[PDB]
Structure formats: structure tokens, C-alpha cells
């Protein structure tokens, strides 16, 4: 397809790619540090978000390389394209760390329907790939705001 | 045990935890390029060290949080507490990404080496841990490096 | 091997078991009185610690065995051997038990690193053996303490 | 039932409880130092028995609980209500240890058939309950005065 | 790592890799001259220890392989690295046979316990891989001696 | 049978024996220096030729105590009834070990070749036990020389 676009498109992707191992090393990181006996509800919540996400990951990655690019994942790349602030907890509890994890996706889901939208003009197969994600992310979002409550 | 060591401790493994979740997306980076038809031996190889990396952060995790801490694997804490460069290849080839590989795992064997030395006065069994992974890890140094060959 | 230093580690290990054959009396005893309808979560806890501790002994029953000693895992040798007070509780409730259990293995894990030490120079064999052990109890000290909480 | 006879009784089966515990320590120990090659018929003839002791200290100590009173089977308590001499061996043998044996049996029989007299006129249900242990524990002595022999 | 101790590492492996070599050739050589009708107590118990052994020498070798070397478990190199004397008999019995094992197994159990004390400041990897063989090693010694006995 | 011929064969034998047991030392050191991932063909076609020569040790062995010698097969017994030269590569590759491995086969056909000769008056029945052996080495010597190839 087109040569330039191609560049524009991986480059969404590439971000998106950097915020979805963003989000796994959080989730990953939000489950070693609420992982406590009453706590049981939450530490199993997030297991399979983990795998889901991972997931992500790797249908992004192999659009990417399907373009043409090589995608990145290594650790620089996360924090280059990372848009919002490290995971940082008030408090080490269960609720805080939901309310921060809710922030979180808050940003993921912010990221996402921007590039979804960017990409409305680039590549509309980039983007189902994208809409799709969008869908469960909110939906995890929703279970976790509802632990809170 | 004792309060400070406890947080020397800490630190060490802290260090160790970021080792680990840098070097699976660093495995997993690698897996993404390396994803070809004569590739085959080798996008099979990553799998397994892949899975078993991410067990030993988990390993690693879990310690500290017996030790009373609460362990990071955000994304700013793995550059923060990182060491050598960033994975960058001269070329996209199996062999470039090997070589490279392989000076990534010359990275980890050596500051795991460090933490156990640092670790033999500070905390023997957070060491048997590590040297578990050293043996592990040092093993699966040689199948990259058999393969350049 | 050495028969002085083999007087020196079996009086270590000597002690250890009987550190051991304490703990797992102790803890069919905090089991007998903590089992009641809310708290099952505990009663359950308790079981498998019970059965590897009890492991514990034999492994270095037969050790002490193993060099050329005999085993001692009579009541008198468990009061003789035995470093810190006795098993009282304060009250008879869930979490006062938790407590006076999370501080005999404050007892256990601390003799026992003491053993680790004093066999460093004595026997990396029977010490490597300790080790392994200290990692677990120190882990299900772990889960008492996040209990108390 | 009476408020007294219920600590009169507490008290009779807090001492059978401590029997116990003291016995399938003891076994535990036997069963140590008698693991040899031509020794075989005896390390099995232990095994059983400690199993079937455990047993009995745990319908004790579940009774006392449902008297009202808390079981008590720590270190202390056992040396405390302990009436005979600890285990000691003459020599380092299968009948030494078997004849040894032999009469740590003499004194648990012996002081369960007083807590059964003591209890004619108490708590028949706790009579019963040791009775049926005394059947038992009589039966076990045979077996190894037939070794003996 | 240190290219030199790697050499020095390799070499003190390479002594154990022959000590292990010459132990199973041993342990079959013992194997074949007892195979005797009330022997079968003896000739079952080698059967498992030839096969352990080997493992041992196995692990031995691919750890060399993994630090850069050759493994050389050729004759000429047993006879080489060999410590101790060849394994006579005074004659050919069933316990003269054990007695000669077992005095090789002090000869074994020594050279290993050397290495690993050797390892102390070189390699801690290398130095649990032996550690490990040195307990079971060492308990099997203890069952050839209670036959003995 | 005869007095001194049993002397004389049990010797032949006895050669055999150490011929066998050079032969699966060095299989097994050939097998632990070609273990790499293009030179799997090969690391497979040694695993079965080392049972079948462990094997064929255990047949002579028993056929030597069957004539009423002891069999020896001890490290010493080996370098002093070896004929041919140490396993020395020129250099470690496939190719290489592969080579060296056709002239130990060489040498392993010959002298069984001349032990047959030998045994042509001596024994018939030893000789037909060594006959079948070589029809099977002077078969995996083709299986290496084809590999050469
Ligand atoms: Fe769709
Ligand atoms: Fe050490
Ligand atoms: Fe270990
Ligand atoms: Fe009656
Ligand atoms: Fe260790
Ligand atoms: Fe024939």
C-alpha cells in the first residue's frame, strides 16, 4: 500500500504496541503487590486480563511486521511512547491500587480511541484491530470500578 | 530478620526483578522479529526461556514480598535500575539478533553473578535463588551462542 | 569426613530438629484450639504446614543419621534444645494465635539462620539442606502475617 | 454438666493427651534410629502405629475442646504431665530399642487404665473413648514383645 | 565471566567428571562380582546408584560444555585426574566388596567435598551442582555401610 | 572344562571386557562434545550404539563369571589391556569426532577380529558370543563412515 501512511500507521501501532507492555508489566506489577487472603477476588481478576493483554500485544506486533516494520517492545521504546505517569500508589492497599489501575486504563483506553481515530484516514483494518481491543479494555475497566464501588 | 540487610536485600532483588521483566520483553522483542520460515528453530527455542523468565520474576517478586517489601515491575523502574544499553541490532537478520541476544544474556549472567556475590554475607537463601537462575540462565546462554556457530 | 566437626554439625542439626519436632507440636496445638466456624480459612492454613514441617524433621533426622550420629526427637531433647518461651497465648481468638505464631517462627527462622551460619565454615551440604528449609518457613510466615492483617 | 468434674475430667485428659504426643514422639524417634536392612520388619511395624497415635491425641484434644477447655499439646505441657523417664537406650540396637519400647508401652497402658479408673465415677463417654485407645496401644505392646521373642 | 577461573572452574569439573566415570565403572565392577543368590539384597541396591551416577556425570558435562570447554571422559583422562588407589579386594565376598565401596565413597565424598570448597570463591553455580551430588552420594554411602553392619 | 584354556579364555575376555568399556566412554565423550543443533543427526545415532556396548559388557562380564573368574572392569584394568591410543580430535567438529570415531572402530573390529581368531580352538561357544557382537560394531562403523560421507 501506500509507502508514507505505512510509516504513519506503524508508528499508531508501534505506540500502541508500547501501551499495551506498558499495561501487562503494570498488571503484572498491580498483582505481585495485592496478592493477600481477602484479596483472593482481585489477584484472580487480573490473571486473565494479563494473558488477554499479552495477547494484545502480540496480534499488534504481527501487524506491524505484516507492514513491512519491525516492532519494538523492548523497555526503552515503553517509556519513549508512554503518554501518562508511571504507576505510582498512595497507599498499598486493595482499593488503591484499583483506583490507580482504573487511572491507568482511563489512559489506555484515552490512547487507544485516539489512534482509533487517527487511524480513520490511514488503515481501517489497523483499526477493527484496535475498535476490538477498545471493547474489552472498557469492559475490564468496568469490573474494576466496580470493585471499587 | 534484620531491618536494614532486610532493605539491602530488598534493593538487590529489586534490581534483579527489573533484570528479569527487561529481559522478557526483551525475549519477547526478539521473538517478534525473528518470526520466519527458516527461522523456525529459533522462534521455538525463545518459547520455553520466554515462559521460564517470567517465572523467575515471579520467583524474585514473591521473595520480596515475604521479606516485607513490595515489588516493582513498572516500566520506570526497569530502565532506572538497568545497567547495559538498550537492545539495538546493526541488522535484521537471525544471526544480528543471536549475537545480540547473547550479549544481553552476558548482561544478566553478570549483574546475577553480582546480587549473589553482594548476597553471600547479606542473605543465603535470596541467593540459593539466584544461583538457581544463574545455572538456568548460563544454559540457555550456550544454546544462542551453539547457534551463531 | 572430619569427626570433630562431625560432632559440631550433628549438635547443629540435633538442634534443628528439635526446632522442628517443637513447631510441628506447636502448630497441631494452635490447630486444636483455632478450629471454628469463621475461622476455616485458618484451620486449613495450618494443615500443610503440619505435614512439611513434620517432613522437615525426617529430612534431618536422616542427615544426622546419615553422618554416623543418632537422632534425638524425645520431648526432653526438645525443651533442653529449645531457645525461646513456650506457646502461651494472651487471649483465646483467632488472631492472638496468629500472632503467637508469627512470632515462634520469628524463633524458628532466626535459630535457623543461625544454623545456616555457623555450618558455613562446618558443612555447605547439611547447611544448602537448612537453607531450602528457612526460604518455605520464612514464606509461611508470610501467610500468617498477611492473616493478622 | 458439672462445672467442676468438667476440670477434674479436662484435666485427666489433658495429662492422655500429653501420653500421646510424648508416645508418637517417641515412635518417631524409635522409628529413626532403627532404619537398617535387617531391620525392615520393624521400621514398617512403627508406621502404622504412629499414625494411629496422632490419631488418638486428636480425638482427645477434639474432646477436651468440646468439654469447653483448650487442648494443650506443646513441649512444656508434655514434660509437665509426663510420669515415667524419657527414652533412653542402653545400646544402639533393635532389641535394645524394641525392649525400650517395650516399656514406654508398659507406662502409657498403665497410666491410661488410671485415667479410665479415675474417670468411673466422672465422665463415662471420656471412659469409653480410652478404653477403646487401651485395646489398641495393649495390642501394639504384643507385637513387639513377639519381636523379642 | 573470568576467563581465567573458567579455566580454573573448568578444570576442577573436569576432575569430577572423571571422578564420576571412574565411580560407575567401579560401581559396575562391583556389580558383576556380586551377583550372587544371597547377594540379591546388594546387587539391586548398585542398580539405581550406577544409574545416578551417570546422571551426575552427565550434568558434570554439560556444565563444562555450557562454560566454553571440552568434557573429556576418555580412560586415559579417568587414570589422569584419578585420586585415589584402584579398587582391590582382599577377596571375593560380599562384604569385603562393600567394604572396598564404601572406602571408595570416602575417597569420593572427599575429592567432591574439595571441589566444593575450592568453588567457594570461584563459581557458587558450579559449587551447588556439587553440593547436591555430595548428599546423596554421602547417603548412599551410608546404606552400603549399614549393610556392612 | 579345561583348567588352563579357562585361564586363557577368561583373559581374551577379560580384553574384551576393557575393549567394551573403552568404547562406552568414549561413545559417551564423543556424545557430550557433539551435542549441538545442526549435529543433531548425530548426538541421536550415538545414544542406542552406547546401550548396545554397556550391553555387550554385561554379556562378557557374566560370561567370564560364568566360567568362574571375576570380571574387571575397572578404570586401571582398561588403559592396561587397551591397545590403541586415546581418544585425541585434531579439532572439535562433527566431522572431526565423527572421524576419530572410525578408527576406534577400526581398532574395536580388529581386536575383536583377533580375540574370535583365538578363541577359534579355544572356545566356541565365547567365540560365537564375540561373532555376533562384531557383525553389529563392523555395522555402526558403516553408519559413521556414511556420515563422513
Ligand atoms: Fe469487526
Ligand atoms: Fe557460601
Ligand atoms: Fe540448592
Ligand atoms: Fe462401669
Ligand atoms: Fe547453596
Ligand atoms: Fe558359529
Do not use: C
Amino acid at each position: 500500500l501506500s509507502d508514507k501512511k505505512a510509516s504513519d500507521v506503524a508508528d499508531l501501532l508501534q505506540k500502541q504496541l508500547s501501551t499495551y507492555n506498558d499495561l501487562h508489566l503494570t498488571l503484572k506489577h498491580v498483582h505481585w503487590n495485592v496478592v493477600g487472603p481477602n484479596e483472593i477476588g482481585v489477584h484472580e481478576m487480573i490473571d486473565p486480563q494479563v494473558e488477554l493483554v499479552r495477547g494484545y500485544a502480540d496480534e499488534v506486533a504481527e501487524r506491524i511486521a505484516t507492514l513491512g516494520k519491525s516492532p519494538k517492545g523492548t523497555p526503552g521504546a515503553i517509556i519513549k511512547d508512554r503518554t501518562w505517569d508511571d504507576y505510582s500508589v498512595e497507599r498499598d492497599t486493595v482499593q488503591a491500587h484499583l483506583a490507580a489501575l482504573d487511572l491507568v486504563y482511563n489512559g489506555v483506553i484515552e490512547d487507544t480511541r485516539k489512534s482509533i481515530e487517527k487511524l480513520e484516514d490511514l488503515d481501517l483494518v489497523s483499526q477493527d484491530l484496535l475498535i476490538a481491543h477498545a471493547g474489552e479494555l472498557e469492559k475490564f475497566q468496568w469490573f474494576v470500578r466496580a470493585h471499587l464501588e
